[PDB]
Each structure stands twice: as structure tokens, then as C-alpha cells.
Amino acid sequence: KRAQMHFFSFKDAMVFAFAPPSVLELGNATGFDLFLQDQAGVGHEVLLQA
Amino acid sequence: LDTAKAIRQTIANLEPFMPQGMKVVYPYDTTPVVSASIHEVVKTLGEAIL
Amino acid sequence: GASAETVQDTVVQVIEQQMNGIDNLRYISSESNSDGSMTITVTFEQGTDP
Amino acid sequence: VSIAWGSSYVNDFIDRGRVKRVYLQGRPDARMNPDDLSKWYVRNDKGEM
């Protein structure tokens, strides 16, 4: 974070630098994970808005 | 028993996208005989003990 | 020289549709990109022989 | 011979978001009976039919 403020505060380009979880085998990244799907076949627009 | 369960569960999630006038039916399904067999024998078992 | 869309409907979708009848298949995912690359990740249940 | 009767697969096409196939088979009434096939005329080297 002592480098997170440096650029994450840019309209120029996000620069989210982060560290890997406890055990690498699963991740590159801590916190949670999921996928929003398309069962109706609405198409790309809706899911993008969702 | 786990499998038949799981699928019923995968359609339950998919039914709520199906059109106006389609319903899902389960014509063939041997799952029940499995549960009937174990319910019976289990039952006798307990008659055996009494 | 292909667009995400080209790799997704010419390659990434022709594969995904065959990705079945595979044991202990937990979940399948994929990505299609501007550089033309793609990857399908078929993740399995704990205990599968790799 | 193998396009009218034997519905020939030519290529894919997206349908509401899923790749599906494209078959090319002669009309049903043009593969029903033995003489129903005499209908199918081919091309002639010298342009003719």
C-alpha cells in the first residue's frame, strides 16, 4: 500500500500492486472469486451491465 | 442417490429461465428403487432385532 | 490475427462442447483474447489422478 | 450424389450464442423414390446441363 496510493490514484491508469496468498497452489491472489453467467442468452450487453 | 439429487438441483437453477409453456418431466428414473431397497432391509433389520 | 470473438466461436466453443464424459470434472472455464490466444481450464475434484 | 440425399455438413453458424451446424440436403421430395433421383441434373464440361 506504501506504493498502492502512488498510482492507484491516477486517471492515467490503475496500478493495483498486490501480494500472493498463504499457499500459491490456488490463486495468485487473496480474497474471494466468482463468475456471473448468461443462462438466458441475453447476450454480451446485459451481462456487461450486470 | 447423490447424482440424481445433484442433477435435479442443476435443473432447478435452469428452470427459472425456461420459456412460458415448457415443464421438465422425469419419465425414466431408477433412483427410487435404491431408496426403497435400503428403507425396507433397514426396516426388517430392526424387526430382526426386536 | 483473430479477435476474441473469432477465437471463441471458431475454437473455444467447438472444444467446450466436447468437454464432457470426463471423470471427476468439477468445473470448466475459458478465455479468448485480442492477441488471439485462448485457454480452457478444466479444474478437477481433489484426488483425481492428473 | 452425397449432398442432396446425404445431407452434407458445410460449416458452423452462431445461434443465439452457440455454435451449431449447417446442413445442406436436397428438398425431401427429391430423394424419396428410385426415379425421384433422375431429377438431379449435373453440369456439363461444355457449360451445358
Side-chain angles (χ1 to χ4, degrees):
Chain A
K1 318 319 295 180
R2 184 173 65 191
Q4 169 64 295
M5 297 185 280
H6 209 69
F7 272 91
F8 172 56
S9 63
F10 265 48
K11 192 72 79 70
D12 186 353
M14 291 87 84
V15 180
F16 168 52
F18 59 98
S22 176
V23 38
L24 304 83
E25 202 186 8
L26 67 170
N28 295 291
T30 72
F32 57 83
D33 184 311
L34 75 150
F35 287 73
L36 301 50
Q37 292 184 67
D38 173 10
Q39 255 57 60
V42 327
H44 179 45
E45 180 194 353
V46 181
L47 200 184
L48 190 68
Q49 294 169 180
Chain B
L1 299 167
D2 276 31
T3 303
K5 179 182 170 175
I7 112 281
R8 291 197 140 88
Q9 175 64 56
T10 302
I11 67 88
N13 296 317
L14 289 190
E15 297 172 311
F17 299 116
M18 311 176 134
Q20 173 67 182
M22 76 170 258
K23 75 166 184 167
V24 50
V25 302
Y26 297 95
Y28 195 57
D29 179 336
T30 60
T31 321
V33 181
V34 172
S35 280
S37 290
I38 277 43
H39 184 282
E40 294 303 344
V41 59
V42 160
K43 209 194 56 45
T44 108
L45 176 283
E47 303 182 318
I49 122 147
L50 282 166
Chain C
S3 52
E5 241 286 299
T6 313
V7 46
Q8 171 199 280
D9 308 325
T10 86
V11 183
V12 185
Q13 253 182 38
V14 59
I15 306 304
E16 294 194 347
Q17 293 185 185
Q18 291 287 13
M19 287 306 102
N20 64 75
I22 302 318
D23 280 286
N24 306 290
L25 187 168
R26 175 186 276 194
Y27 62 60
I28 180 180
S29 87
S30 66
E31 54 164 64
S32 295
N33 328 254
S34 330
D35 64 19
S37 65
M38 77 70 184
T39 314
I40 304 180
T41 299
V42 186
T43 292
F44 294 64
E45 238 75 74
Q46 239 72 37
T48 315
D49 171 32
Chain D
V1 301
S2 302
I3 306 179
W5 299 258
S7 50
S8 161
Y9 177 37
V10 313
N11 45 72
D12 300 314
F13 88 90
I14 55 183
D15 175 344
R16 208 245 301 197
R18 161 184 263 239
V19 172
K20 300 194 175 70
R21 296 184 171 62
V22 168
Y23 281 86
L24 160 63
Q25 177 161 35
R27 293 163 56 73
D29 73 70
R31 59 160 184 274
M32 286 282 104
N33 287 79
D35 64 53
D36 204 308
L37 50 57
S38 287
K39 301 167 62 183
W40 294 82
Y41 279 60
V42 191
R43 188 70 65 63
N44 187 60
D45 291 61
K46 297 170 172 56
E48 293 185 336
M49 203 98 276

